[PDB]
Amino acid sequence: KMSDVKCTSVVLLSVLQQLRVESSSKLWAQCVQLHNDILLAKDTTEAFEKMVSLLSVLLSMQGAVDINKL
Amino acid sequence: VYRAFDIYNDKVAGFAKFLKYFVVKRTFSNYQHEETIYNLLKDCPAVAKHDFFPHISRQRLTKYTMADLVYALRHFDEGNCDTLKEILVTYNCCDDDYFNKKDWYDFVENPDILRVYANLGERVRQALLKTVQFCDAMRNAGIVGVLTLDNQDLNGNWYDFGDFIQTTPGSGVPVVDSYYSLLMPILTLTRALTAESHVDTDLTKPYIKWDLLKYDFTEERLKLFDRYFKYWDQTYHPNCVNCLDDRCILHCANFNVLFSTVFPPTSFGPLVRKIFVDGVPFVVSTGYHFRELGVVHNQDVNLHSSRLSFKELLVYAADPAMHAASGNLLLDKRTTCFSVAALTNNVAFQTVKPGNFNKDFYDFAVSKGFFKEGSSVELKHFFFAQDGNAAISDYDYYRYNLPTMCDIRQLLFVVEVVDKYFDCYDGGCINANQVIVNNLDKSAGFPFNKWGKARLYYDSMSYEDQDALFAYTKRNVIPTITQMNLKYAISAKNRARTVAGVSICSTMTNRQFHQKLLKSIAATRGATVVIGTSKFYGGWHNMLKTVYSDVENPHLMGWDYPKCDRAMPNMLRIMASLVLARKHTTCCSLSHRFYRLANECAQVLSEMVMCGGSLYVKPGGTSSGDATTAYANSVFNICQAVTANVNALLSTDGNKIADKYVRNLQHRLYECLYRNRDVDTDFVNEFYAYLRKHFSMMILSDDAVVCFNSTYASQGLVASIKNFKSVLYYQNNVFMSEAKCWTETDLTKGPHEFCSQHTMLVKQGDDYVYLPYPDPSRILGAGCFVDDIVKTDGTLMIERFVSLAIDAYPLTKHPNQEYADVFHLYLQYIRKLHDELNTSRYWEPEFYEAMYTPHTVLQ
Amino acid sequence: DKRAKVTSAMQTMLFTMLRKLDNDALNNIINNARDGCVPLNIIPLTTAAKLMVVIPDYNTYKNTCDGTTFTYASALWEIQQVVDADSKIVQLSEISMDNSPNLAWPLIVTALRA
Amino acid sequence: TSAMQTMLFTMLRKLDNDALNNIINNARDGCVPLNIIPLMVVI
Ligand SMILES: O=C(N[C@@H](Cc1ccc(O)cc1)C(=O)O)c1cc(-c2ccccc2)c(=O)n2c1sc1ccc(OC3CCCCC3)cc12
Ligand SMILES: O=C(N[C@@H](Cc1ccc(O)cc1)C(=O)O)c1cc(-c2ccccc2)c(=O)n2c1sc1ccc(OC3CCCCC3)cc12
Ligand SMILES: O=C(N[C@@H](Cc1ccc(O)cc1)C(=O)O)c1cc(-c2ccccc2)c(=O)n2c1sc1ccc(OC3CCCCC3)cc12
């Protein structure tokens, strides 16, 4: 399950960058580090924890795309 | 034991390793001859103490000589580099356990090796001074003979006074062509002239408080030359304006590279002056202080001008003088690159977005059985992202560019050989109305990029203004500005990528200078340089058969240049520029051609870079935005190849070369190198002919494939892979590991990879041909992810896929079924995309068949 | 047409860039040369009244900008308006080794010649 | 422009990974975190 998680992380940053996350140097650097790690990842478990970290970063921000509706 | 030697006599010549404190040796005539010469040359403190005992006792020598250090650093091989280790640890340059580290030898990895080498700098500089003292005594005592590196120990003491012959006193003339020439590469690697930066050439005293307003240093340069290269028997022009030919320019620019490391870094770059326009005072460049070409003064300097014409304004806008004078002093601590100033009140940080994943294609591909967990075709190429401090991090890679001094006598021969490779093309100056411009939308550089692309300026200027501007550049220097940005790319690595936009002023004049030659090379088929030859319509097949010309025992080979665009020394780039300008023997004079050379050297070699929001100084390297960088790379590529063959053919013992013609080729190659300062047009032909027969090159910018006679390469008559590693170490300051180098023994399977493409012999029409195919991951990677300009219109998506299908068609012939299935997937997807929206129809395989059949070369 | 507009833009840029350099400092530098010719690198070094320092981490700040004044380019400089990579204002009391993980490095330290 | 997030969440559902769906369900009713998960919560 390599391709699915990598594409998911790519689109996850695609979403994050649209939430104006560029404005935070530390957070954006961390997100880019996680994304590049996922893309360079060769093992599924590593991709999983990095993906959940990135998703938690995305989902912590309130006022973003509604999640209750989905 | 094996010790390096530099030998040239009536039977063998070269610089290789042969077999042979208080050193001793063992004839009556020689013993009497040497003793008399020694007595006449004893009171000089630059020679080692000698004793008369049938043996010539030689007292208090070092374990290794200067030749070993020169040879070891010039033929570096991390597999067998012991002799280098002993010298470094012996002389307290580092610790023995320092070699437990990984990549200790590497320059890019562990750049602290530079400090270790620099610990030999003072030791080497002391050797230089002793040589002048030694040569002084020989001159006074009337002695003639050749000074050889092997006869000087690492402490500077000379010995072995046997080759010399007596003559009338006060008229001695020593020959130092071989000594200095072979030693130059180590002078900058060890920073020999570091001590010259202190008050009295003492490494225990403060740095000289150079006057900030000084720029000339011509007298300082002459004094430096006179102290170290006193008997270097060729006039040295501190300012290369005075040279008589490009062979002098290379000669004198090489020295200026070494001498510019002692002067303050603030004394270089454009020299400004206060001029008045209609009474208002500007600050403009009325000269330039190159680290290589010395001081150059513009000849058309005008003051109190009533008004500024369009041509005049372009020169002033491009000049960084006004930009650097109006900005704030900048102290950037992220980089070690000298910073001139900041042009804005705040530093700007720029980031690289992620890739725009295309779900539609991905869901289609998986349904067709792709991406099954465990297949040989997967995803390995992605649009990587970058954080804010990436551009400056990318720019800081220029720290790999170091001042490199070249083996001038060797470079002056390689240039003649490299010149023959370009002797089948026509070129020269052309007017503003004969220039053809492709891709007018290229950025015009800073500040011109504020108001449009190169299309705007080319439209505004009349043919006369362009002509005068070109004529202006033939008598002055225009130091323009280049702007570096970040670019989106698909790659298997997260390294950032940048594209440089050179100033429009520099591109306009360069095209009028090189366009005629560039077109000639691009329109030629069958030559060593293959640029502008399409792989389609059998081109790949014809290209390969040209490489395969007549090589007797062919194997293929390939290599790479680590950090090529960043680590290329300035001497080799200047050399490449001179080779290209050799066609102007009728459209330009000596003075005219020098002011042309100075313009590229100030525009695309050591110009000022507007990175981020501030202004820095580029130490060297190539500019991706220049049009001639690809062709200049080819000259650099061939020069490195010819240098490898010269080092290969001179570092191999001539006694063990069973052939007779080759041994004669070796002996005469040495003569034309370190003797015979005239260009021996005859011998240059034989070597060029010899290379073409046994070392056939298909060269495109910084990438090459070589069909080389294996037997000769095996026994050292032709460059091998190790030879390229050796050359890059001491002429590029980079370690080139074999992990990225490939060699192939069977020609049926074409080159392993050339310009990022693979080869496979396939059957078409009862005939076997070569087809170029890419790595399927790239083809799939470029389909899944797109740069976000295609979403506006589906047509752009179609053209993207067809272009990928064209390059994917050869996979159909691959033995692997997964690979062949890739092209069908793209064709089926194209059908779907075309459906939603005889051989000219891109939705049938016949369209993609014609692209690789020579019978129809129609475009 | 386009030539006219680009000419106007270039003239405007050159004249605006002149209204912020001419001074007694530059004139003094120019008249101290052999023939009023000087390296371009030393003009902003010895004439600029504004200094920008981009600080990557905290060790560099210790080692360059401790206290409220520092010496660089053979001159005394006085610090004002330190700023982070997020472009927010930073107070001199916030620059400490224990607080260093919280700050958005690199830091832009601006200084006036004094 | 919200389609990107809808496609994101469709992909997340398609993955059907335990941790990701766990966190998505947790945030379903509004229980969301504030900081990056190390390699604190509300309610
Ligand atoms: O940037 C490029 N490719 C993308 C991917 C891509 C882009 C467009 C496309 O549909 C398909 C894939 C990437 O690797 O990130 C690219 C693509 C192409 C290309 C596009 C369609 C058909 C054939 C070639 C391309 O031609 N190029 C690029 S980067 C690039 C850099 C130098 C270059 O030199 C040529 C210029 C013209 C002749 C003289 C030398 C070309 C060049
Ligand atoms: O260097 C390349 N790619 C870089 C990225 C890159 C580099 C430079 C650049 O600005 C843009 C992107 C990477 O993979 O890391 C590259 C990629 C591709 C490629 C991309 C997608 C799909 C298939 C092939 C590619 O096709 N190429 C490269 S370098 C490269 C050099 C020459 C070239 O043309 C051939 C044509 C036939 C005669 C010999 C010259 C093609 C070529
Ligand atoms: O690196 C490249 N060019 C260099 C050197 C060069 C190469 C060939 C040439 O005569 C002239 C100059 C340059 O001028 O900067 C290069 C060139 C070409 C090219 C070569 C011949 C004819 C047309 C295009 C080129 O096509 N490319 C490059 S770097 C490069 C990167 C990506 C890329 O994607 C394509 C690959 C094929 C499928 C669709 C996406 C293409 C690509």
mmCIF file of C-alpha atoms in Angstrom, chain B residues 16 19 167 271 274 390 494 701 727:
data_model
loop_
_atom_site.group_PDB
_atom_site.id
_atom_site.type_symbol
_atom_site.label_atom_id
_atom_site.label_comp_id
_atom_site.label_asym_id
_atom_site.label_seq_id
_atom_site.Cartn_x
_atom_site.Cartn_y
_atom_site.Cartn_z
ATOM 1 C CA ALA B 16 54.225 8.219 -13.798
ATOM 2 C CA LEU B 19 60.302 1.174 -9.676
ATOM 3 C CA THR B 167 78.780 26.930 -18.683
ATOM 4 C CA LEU B 271 34.872 49.670 -10.369
ATOM 5 C CA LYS B 274 31.098 59.539 -10.332
ATOM 6 C CA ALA B 390 15.574 26.656 0.482
ATOM 7 C CA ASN B 494 13.976 16.296 -2.676
ATOM 8 C CA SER B 701 26.078 19.024 -22.499
ATOM 9 C CA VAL B 727 40.949 14.537 -13.277
#
